[PDB]
Design a protein around this ligand. Structure first.
Ligand SMILES: [Ca+2]
Ligand SMILES: [Ca+2]
Ligand SMILES: [Mg+2]
Ligand SMILES: [Mg+2]
Ligand SMILES: [Mg+2]
Ligand SMILES: [Mg+2]
Ligand SMILES: [Mg+2]
Ligand SMILES: [Mg+2]
Ligand SMILES: [Mg+2]
Ligand SMILES: [Mg+2]
Ligand SMILES: [Mg+2]
Ligand SMILES: [Mg+2]
Ligand SMILES: [Mg+2]
Ligand SMILES: [Mg+2]
Ligand SMILES: [Mg+2]
Ligand SMILES: [Mg+2]
Ligand SMILES: [Mg+2]
Ligand SMILES: [Mg+2]
Ligand SMILES: [Mg+2]
Ligand SMILES: [Mg+2]
Ligand SMILES: [Mg+2]
Ligand SMILES: [Mg+2]
Ligand SMILES: [Mg+2]
Ligand SMILES: [Mg+2]
Ligand SMILES: [Mg+2]
Ligand SMILES: [Mg+2]
Ligand SMILES: [Mg+2]
Ligand SMILES: [Mg+2]
Ligand SMILES: [Mg+2]
Ligand SMILES: [Mg+2]
Ligand SMILES: [Mg+2]
Ligand SMILES: [Mg+2]
Ligand SMILES: [Mg+2]
Ligand SMILES: [Mg+2]
Ligand SMILES: [Mg+2]
Ligand SMILES: [Mg+2]
Ligand SMILES: [Mg+2]
Ligand SMILES: [Mg+2]
Ligand SMILES: [Mg+2]
Ligand SMILES: [Mg+2]
Ligand SMILES: [Mg+2]
Ligand SMILES: [Mg+2]
Ligand SMILES: [Mg+2]
Ligand SMILES: [Mg+2]
Ligand SMILES: [Mg+2]
Ligand SMILES: [Mg+2]
Ligand SMILES: [Mg+2]
Ligand SMILES: [Mg+2]
Ligand SMILES: [Mg+2]
Ligand SMILES: [Mg+2]
Ligand SMILES: [Mg+2]
Ligand SMILES: [Mg+2]
Ligand SMILES: [Mg+2]
Ligand SMILES: [Mg+2]
Ligand SMILES: [Mg+2]
Ligand SMILES: [Mg+2]
Ligand SMILES: [Mg+2]
Ligand SMILES: [Mg+2]
Ligand SMILES: [Mg+2]
Ligand SMILES: [Mg+2]
Ligand SMILES: [Mg+2]
Ligand SMILES: [Mg+2]
Ligand SMILES: [Mg+2]
Ligand SMILES: [Mg+2]
Ligand SMILES: [Mg+2]
Ligand SMILES: [Mg+2]
Ligand SMILES: [Mg+2]
Ligand SMILES: [Mg+2]
Ligand SMILES: [Mg+2]
Ligand SMILES: [Mg+2]
Ligand SMILES: [Mg+2]
Ligand SMILES: [Mg+2]
Ligand SMILES: [Mg+2]
Lengths: 117, 115, 57, 129
RNA sequence: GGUCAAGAUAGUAAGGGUCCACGGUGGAUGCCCUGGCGCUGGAGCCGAUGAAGGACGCGAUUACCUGCGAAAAGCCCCGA
RNA sequence: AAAGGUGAAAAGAACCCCGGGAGGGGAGUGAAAGAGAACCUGAAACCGUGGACUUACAAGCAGUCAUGGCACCUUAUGCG
RNA sequence: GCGAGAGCUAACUUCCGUAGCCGAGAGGGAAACAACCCAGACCAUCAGCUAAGGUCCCUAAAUGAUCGCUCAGUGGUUAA
RNA sequence: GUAGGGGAGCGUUCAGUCCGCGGAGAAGCCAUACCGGAAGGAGUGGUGGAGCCGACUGAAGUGCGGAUGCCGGCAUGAGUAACGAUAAAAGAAGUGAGAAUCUUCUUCGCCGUAAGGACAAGGGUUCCUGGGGAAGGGUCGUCCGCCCAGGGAAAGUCGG
């Protein structure tokens, strides 16, 4: 019994090719560059996911001291003074509190400063 | 460069661009008008036009000057006896060009030269 | 000696050479004497006029 | 309006091609014929007959004979009125390709591609608008 | 509202890109058999009575193949 | 060396239209001409036409992740 | 890196010993950078703490507090 | 986690058995936002027009991105280089769907111990006539050494 490759290879190739949407040029049309681009793209997808965690970390922080200094203290002497205010621990995305309710972020500034005295 | 040269190479050497303009001049005067490439008609004009001013001389000298460019004795007599005397009123406008269509083998605009 | 091209040209890059291969439409005009079709400073090919008849057609 | 299946529809309705003719296997290079066809495209069908007698390209002849056939079918078969007609679509595609060996220096041949064209035109009334 | 100043910001595509829709080219894939492959088993020499293999011919019209051989796509006898 | 396929049946396209033709568009036949003799299917590379979103201060292994814009709504109003 | 020979107490040299890394080791730092510093990636999270290394703006985080030092851009290139 | 060892599996053809499906439409092809831990598998729609899925077992020519790998198709270079001796060509007239290129006329230029003529080798109808215009002709083509048909080839003394 002979068992030629037919239908198998086209199906595999077409699944690779379909992963290529708006890939530029022969990235979208030739199988070999499509598959090769996907190897490097693997690298990027995994690394980036882990990194995106750390990137939103950064955006968080960068808003929080901007509001903090608007109230006359930096990030450092703030997220300290909430933690030194101990039970105050809300921590996760204080960014949004600073970015939408300033009546609240002002009270948190007063709390941190009271804790540092 | 050529800041004041007059005339055309017609993608032809010295010997030929004369034997052209002589042969074409012989046909215009033998035919009244001919149809040729627009460029050869632009160069053909002043040569034939001067040549018939030579024939406006009447005398034997002008006849033999015309003969050295036009080697068919009949056309020589036509210009010498028929046309030039007809033009003896005419401060040199002896030729016009119309340009007809554009041909198909080589795509060259062509034109009429007439009297 | 013998220069030869280095990579194949991309469809994008070659098509943007050809950005300048557009033919110019003839500027056609209406013969005042014939019916229509005429090219400027030329005879009308149909009727032969260029103020009266010129060429035979 | 809605049919029982596809065997259905092949009996009940016949596909037809209003305003369309095509010259297949015309022995010319498609990118050339495309230069002149692009000059036609979207013009009022009279102008297209007018522009093509003065365009000085060799392709104008086959391209015009297709345009006349499109004008003809729109009138004789499709019963359109011809002072409305204009070239809604026109477009040239590859044909087969004749090939010959042509000897070159030192012994080697090359293959040379005599390319054909499928030139097609599709006229329609300007009663769009 | 209109000039004047300062500032900001849209649309144009010569041609390009991604996607979609529609075709062209081209002959993969599926289906098919007129063609092959092997094993098994039969059968196994032909020629001076001209072998094997060819050449030239034989048709109303015949270039190729097939059949035939100046009696030449056939002639005689027998059986179905 | 390459070698293949109308249709069940040739019913193998009378007639008309543009064209010197080639080619096509109709009318007919046929279940189908979404089978028409460059005649089963007809992938991909390659060539085009149309449309959506885009692009003429930009440095680019062509992706990846994040967010805004504009389209769209048949495993589909969503973590699209 | 340490301990030695060969070498000029040269070499991103060569040859043994010894520890660790790369080889087969991704991640953070060292501008970039296999070997150096921190640390060994089962998968997901728009949650929190630290290591090396950092906290003027590119660029996450003290234009930090207290004593001094250098007025050379030393910092940000050797010596007799 | 590289060579390497081990484990469990996905998909392809063929065979046996089962369960079945198919012109109210099969395989193949095409789109897709569903599913499974992966190989993969289903749903629905479009195409096609005659075969085929699922399960269990068995046997393999059984899984491609590479090999300056093979066959085939198609691209890039690109409307680029060239269009094969620097012995020129011009006008009129004709034929034709169509003419710079075919026919005619009249000139011009080129060979002339040749680029004229007669034979031998070799080629094999290329010869003439009438037609043609796909391809061949480096462009065109109404023409051709191309294609179709019909004719033409005569020896006692020439050569054997
Ligand atoms: Ca050019
Ligand atoms: Ca070039
Ligand atoms: Mg990354
Ligand atoms: Mg935090
Ligand atoms: Mg000079
Ligand atoms: Mg020249
Ligand atoms: Mg005359
Ligand atoms: Mg004078
Ligand atoms: Mg003189
Ligand atoms: Mg050199
Ligand atoms: Mg040779
Ligand atoms: Mg444009
Ligand atoms: Mg093709
Ligand atoms: Mg099949
Ligand atoms: Mg058999
Ligand atoms: Mg025999
Ligand atoms: Mg016979
Ligand atoms: Mg025979
Ligand atoms: Mg006998
Ligand atoms: Mg009998
Ligand atoms: Mg059949
Ligand atoms: Mg045809
Ligand atoms: Mg026909
Ligand atoms: Mg019917
Ligand atoms: Mg069809
Ligand atoms: Mg079909
Ligand atoms: Mg055909
Ligand atoms: Mg069938
Ligand atoms: Mg087909
Ligand atoms: Mg287009
Ligand atoms: Mg487009
Ligand atoms: Mg600028
Ligand atoms: Mg810009
Ligand atoms: Mg650039
Ligand atoms: Mg020493
Ligand atoms: Mg070393
Ligand atoms: Mg190694
Ligand atoms: Mg290791
Ligand atoms: Mg590392
Ligand atoms: Mg690192
Ligand atoms: Mg870095
Ligand atoms: Mg460094
Ligand atoms: Mg290094
Ligand atoms: Mg590494
Ligand atoms: Mg911390
Ligand atoms: Mg520390
Ligand atoms: Mg900062
Ligand atoms: Mg300080
Ligand atoms: Mg069906
Ligand atoms: Mg699927
Ligand atoms: Mg059937
Ligand atoms: Mg194998
Ligand atoms: Mg490999
Ligand atoms: Mg390969
Ligand atoms: Mg190849
Ligand atoms: Mg040359
Ligand atoms: Mg002539
Ligand atoms: Mg005539
Ligand atoms: Mg023609
Ligand atoms: Mg010539
Ligand atoms: Mg001739
Ligand atoms: Mg005559
Ligand atoms: Mg001779
Ligand atoms: Mg002979
Ligand atoms: Mg003979
Ligand atoms: Mg002859
Ligand atoms: Mg003759
Ligand atoms: Mg003949
Ligand atoms: Mg021809
Ligand atoms: Mg033929
Ligand atoms: Mg030709
Ligand atoms: Mg005699
Ligand atoms: Mg003798």
């Amino acid at each position: 019994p002979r068992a030629k490759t037919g239908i198998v290879r086209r199906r595999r190739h077409k699944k690779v090719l379909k992963r290529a949407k708006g890939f530029w040029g022969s990235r979208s049309k030739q199988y070999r560059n499509a598959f090769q681009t996907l190897l490097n793209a693997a690298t990027y997808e995994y690394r980036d996911r882990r990194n995106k965690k750390r990137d939103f970390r950064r955006l968080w922080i960068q808003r929080i001291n901007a509001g903090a200094r608007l109230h006359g203290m930096n990030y450092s002497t703030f997220i300290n003074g909430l933690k030194r205010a101990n039970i105050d621990l809300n921590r996760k995305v204080l960014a949004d509190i600073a970015a939408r309710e300033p009546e609240a972020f002002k009270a948190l500034v007063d709390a941190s400063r009271n804790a540092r005295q | 460069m050529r800041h004041g040269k007059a005339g055309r190479k017609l993608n032809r050497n010295s010997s030929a661009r004369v034997a052209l303009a002589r042969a074409q001049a012989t046909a215009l005067l033998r035919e009244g008008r001919i149809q040729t490439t627009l460029t050869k008609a632009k160069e053909l004009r002043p040569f034939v036009e001067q040549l018939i001013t030579t024939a406006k001389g009447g005398d034997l000298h002008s006849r033999r000057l015309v003969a050295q460019d036009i080697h068919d004795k009949d056309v020589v007599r036509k210009v010498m006896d028929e046309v030039a005397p007809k033009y003896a009123e005419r401060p040199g406008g002896y030729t016009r060009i119309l340009r007809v269509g554009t041909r198909r083998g080589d795509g060259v605009t062509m034109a009429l030269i007439e009297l | 000696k013998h220069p030869v091209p280095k990579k194949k040209t991309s469809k994008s890059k070659r098509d943007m050479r050809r950005s300048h291969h557009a033919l110019t439409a003839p500027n056609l005009t209406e013969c005042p004497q014939c019916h229509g079709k005429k090219l400027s400073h030329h005879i009308c090919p149909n009727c032969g006029y260029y103020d009266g008849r010129q060429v035979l057609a | 309006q809605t049919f029982r299946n596809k065997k259905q529809r092949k009996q009940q309705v016949k596909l037809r091609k209003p305003g369309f003719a095509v010259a297949k296997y015309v022995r010319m290079s498609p990118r050339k014929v495309r230069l002149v066809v692009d000059v036609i495209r979207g013009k009022s069908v009279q102008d297209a007959e007018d522009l093509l007698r003065f365009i000085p390209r060799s392709a104008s002849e086959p391209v015009a004979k297709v345009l006349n056939s499109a004008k003809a079918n729109a009138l004789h078969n499709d019963e359109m009125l011809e002072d409305r007609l204009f070239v809604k679509e026109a477009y040239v595609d590859a044909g087969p390709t004749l090939k010959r060996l042509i000897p070159r220096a030192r012994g080697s041949a090359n293959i040379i591609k005599k390319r054909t064209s499928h030139i097609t035109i599709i006229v329609a009334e300007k009663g769009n608008k």
